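Why this split exists: single-chain examples teach little about how molecules sit against one another. For that reason, every record in the complexes split bundles all components of an assembly together and asks for one structure covering all of them. Below is a record exactly as it appears in the raw files.
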Amino acid sequence: VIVADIRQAEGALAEIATIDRKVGEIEAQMNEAIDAAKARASQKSAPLLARRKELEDGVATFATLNKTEMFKSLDLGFGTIGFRLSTQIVQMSKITKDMTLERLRQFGISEGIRIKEDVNKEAMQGWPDERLEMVGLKRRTTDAFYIEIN
Amino acid sequence: VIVADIRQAEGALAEIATIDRKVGEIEAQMNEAIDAAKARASQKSAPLLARRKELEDGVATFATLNKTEMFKSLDLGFGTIGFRLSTQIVQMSKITKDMTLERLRQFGISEGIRIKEDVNKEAMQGWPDERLEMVGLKRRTTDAFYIEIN
């Protein structure tokens, strides 16, 4: 396209604003198709997963109440049941994860700590250009074109 | 449900494995409905957004080539066009964001730095219970029931 004068811009920005209105409504129909699918899926499978619970439980009390004689891992053809040992490391009772860090740090244990550092671009903003230059940063100042539909 | 004997478990784990097979196929149909919607949406709007580009550009060269006389922000009824000043702070040319941090830190500027610390649960794992206790951590050891379909 070639926009040779002010009327021809006016033109373009009516078309553009027609596309925005079209597109943005293509994207309403998709979110109705997707909305509907998520709703069918979850409609049909809520009762199946309710039933799977009852049964899952079911076998559970049975396998505990009968535990001592019965087991490792009893094969049931359709799959295995049984008991497994999972160790997890967790906070002590009244101790937050930040208190564990400060302790790791009081004791000098840096292997205990995971750090992710980042530059604070907002204390930066109120610096002069020279202070930025010393920390390896520059203000990039753009004059950019904007079409801005109503 | 009440699973009073080994045959009745066998029962349950055939049903369960039927649900898993049903559900997990409800969830294939949804991802075909959603797959299809994302594909219609993006089919109809690829040409509309191609056209929006041509026009967007279009007005752009026109507004630059004609810049000095023409502008702030010319109103076109359907919306505004023009030029705006956006300042952004960015890395200097051969300087990574980690070198800017180390510099911030060489100079003692802690306001420049954003930290997010975290406990390394993997150096933890090879600790005795007592070392954990001092940093406020405990090994929680669970014996859990597992039904595990084939």
